[PDB]
Symmetry: C2
Subunit: 43 residues, 2 copies
């Protein structure tokens, strides 16, 4: 029972960590569409 | 809080990405996400 927002945010984190520029860019756009409030922290 | 003199490159980019997503800036968010991806930055992206 994971939300769409949760899965999108996790996709974006994984895309960035894996070097997937295209996917990271497109997933970020989709999150921006929903204007999601996210915490983006460094590990 | 970190004053701007105590922020790294990645930290500034991570904050730019959050702000861009939260404001509805698709082109802005896409640009920062790609830059972060090119460096394969290790990020936590959390629903708040």
């Amino acid at each position: 029972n994971l939300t769409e927002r949760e899965e999108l945010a996790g996709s974006l984190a994984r895309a960035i960590a894996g070097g997937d520029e295209k996917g990271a860019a497109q997933v970020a756009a989709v999150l921006a569409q929903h204007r999601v409030a996210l915490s983006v922290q460094l590990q």
